[PDB]
């Protein structure tokens, strides 16, 4: 079900993937101005009732094409708009109302960053009010307690990946790193990103 | 599903708690000499098969009577023994093959601690190879990233609870704090326990 995180207006719900054996995580930011979902996996019946009670959904943000997940189903059931990465605008699996690029702010406090060198071009990462970073696939966590990157054979350009991760590690106020795949970090996120950079340096 | 944690031989599987938007968590320590479950929640057929492939179950440790959870059902389908807190031996909800006291070591490396003042007497906490603390109910986590205790209204004696937590905080090598209710801590566990103590001082 939808669990509250390190702040009372952020939730995550997940689908276990039997093939790392790893949890695929969706995220919700609940706001009076309109709730926002990120890389949403399927919502259970309970989860829908909870989400409707919290005010529904006005935006779904997708970090990359492999994270389309249940976005189409959720859009068909609501009046939400969908935002995706501008680098994948010409061949995206679903219709998006808006294409996001590095430096955009979808709503006040939700900043967009494009990462290079990943398995898809211009994979998005989101900075929510400076202290919460949300990643799609490039930064993930199979071993609980740390942060990892996608393996080398899935990368378009490892040099660009290291540069991307350094940019994330340079975000001065990051406390939490919420990950689309695996174990999210809720405290000392900047320190976990720093350790990750050291493994790639 | 059952997922590996901060070390590859520890797993957790969980059931959602709609009252507080957090999970109820079971834990498994996979060992050549016999697997150990702690406060086990229900196992799906898939999780069963996964556990079976890892060697099954030899012991279930229950930290307190309120975490009996799915222990009966698992006991009925396996030859597991069950261990519980000696302080509740006279009225426990299921038959136990062994009663644990403070200082006991169930198997080498799995040290037992009795906590005082909680909602049940002599609630157990477990210290696995000095660096992983596993708690039942007294220490839990609703806000992801920290550690909390049960509210005052559930405690038998707050003064004893504070002394019990101070003791947990005195375990010098703790990095992970696995909790029966809510968000487990995988890194810097001692520091989270120290912060919790500070809120009770
Ligand atoms: Cl089942
Ligand atoms: Mg993924
Ligand atoms: Mg409990």
Automatic annotation (TrEMBL), chains A, B:
<dbReference type="Pfam" id="PF14597">
    <property type="entry name" value="Lactamase_B_5"/>
</dbReference>
<feature type="binding site">
    <location>
        <position position="67"/>
    </location>
    <ligand>
        <name>Mg(2+)</name>
    </ligand>
</feature>
<feature type="binding site">
    <location>
        <position position="137"/>
    </location>
    <ligand>
        <name>Mg(2+)</name>
    </ligand>
</feature>
<keyword id="KW-0479">Metal-binding</keyword>
<feature type="binding site">
    <location>
        <position position="181"/>
    </location>
    <ligand>
        <name>Mg(2+)</name>
    </ligand>
</feature>
<dbReference type="InterPro" id="IPR036866">
    <property type="entry name" value="RibonucZ/Hydroxyglut_hydro"/>
</dbReference>
<dbReference type="GO" id="GO:0046872">
    <property type="term" value="F:metal ion binding"/>
</dbReference>
<protein>
    <recommendedName>
        <fullName>Metallo-beta-lactamase domain-containing protein</fullName>
    </recommendedName>
</protein>
């Amino acid at each position: 079900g939808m669990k509250s995180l390190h702040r009372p207006d952020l939730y995550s719900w997940s689908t276990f993937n039997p093939a790392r054996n790893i949890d695929f995580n969706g995220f919700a930011w609940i706001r009076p101005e309109g709730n926002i979902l990120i890389d949403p996996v399927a919502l259970s019946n309970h989860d829908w009732k909870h989400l409707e009670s919290l005010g529904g959904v006005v935006w779904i943000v997708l970090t990359n094409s492999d994270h389309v997940r249940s976005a189409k189903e959720i859009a068909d059931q609501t009046y939400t708009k969908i935002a995706g990465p501008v680098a994948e605008k010409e061949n995206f699996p679903i219709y998006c109302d808006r294409w996001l690029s590095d430096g955009d702010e979808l709503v006040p406090g939700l900043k967009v960053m494009e990462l290079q060198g990943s398995k898809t071009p211009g994979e998005l990462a989101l900075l929510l009010e400076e202290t919460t970073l949300i990643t799609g696939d490039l930064v993930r966590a199979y071993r609980a307690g740390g942060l990892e990157i996608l393996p080398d054979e899935k990368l378009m350009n490892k040099q660009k990946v290291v540069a991307s991760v350094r940019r994330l590690a340079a975000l001065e106020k990051v406390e939490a790193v919420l990950v689309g795949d695996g174990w999210s970090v809720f405290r000392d996120g900047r320190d976990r990103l720093k350790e990750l950079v050291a493994t790639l340096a």
